[model samples]
Target chain A: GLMAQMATTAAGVAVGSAVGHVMGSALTGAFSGG
Target chain B: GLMAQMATTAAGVAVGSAVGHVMGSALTGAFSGG
Candidate 1:
């Protein structure tokens, strides 16, 4: 698992960052605007 | 990979949310008056 295929590595961050950004944004709104 | 990923994602969420709660508290304290 050391060397990821370009597709796998790209997909992981794409997916992770999307999920994380959605989560992070929702969280920021909740905390900051509540 | 699909089912396993889903289950693990949820489990990670439980853990992650707990961590987030604790960190959020610390964060608010740190940033509140600064």
Candidate 2:
């Protein structure tokens, strides 16, 4: 029960990280280049 | 040009934060309940 709490947090972090990574690489690069 | 660079980064952070907030609220509540 309690263990799933940690799992949920981890999944959230992973999802957030993935989005951040993509934005950093794509949008940031595009705007900076333009 | 450079100013827009910062804007892009800020937007990325905001997006990531929003996603994190939603996931944290939903997943945390669900896991803790189950």
Best by DockQ: 2
- List the pairs of residues colliding in candidate 2: none
Model 1 docking grade: incorrect
- Tens-place lDDT digits, model 2, residues A7-30: 123342243343322322434322
What's the true lDDT of residue B16 in model 1?
22
Native contact fraction, candidates in order:
0.00, 0.14
Which pairs clash in model 1? none
Q: What is the lDDT of residue A4 in candidate 1?
A: 17
TM-score of chain A of 2: 0.11
Model 1: residues with Cα > 4 Å off, grouped in runs: A1-7, A11-29, B6-34
What are the lDDT figures for the candidates, one per model? 0.21, 0.32
After TM-score superposition, the amount by which residue B17's alpha carbon in candidate 2 deviates from its true location, in angstroms, is 11
Native-vs-model 1 lDDT? 0.21
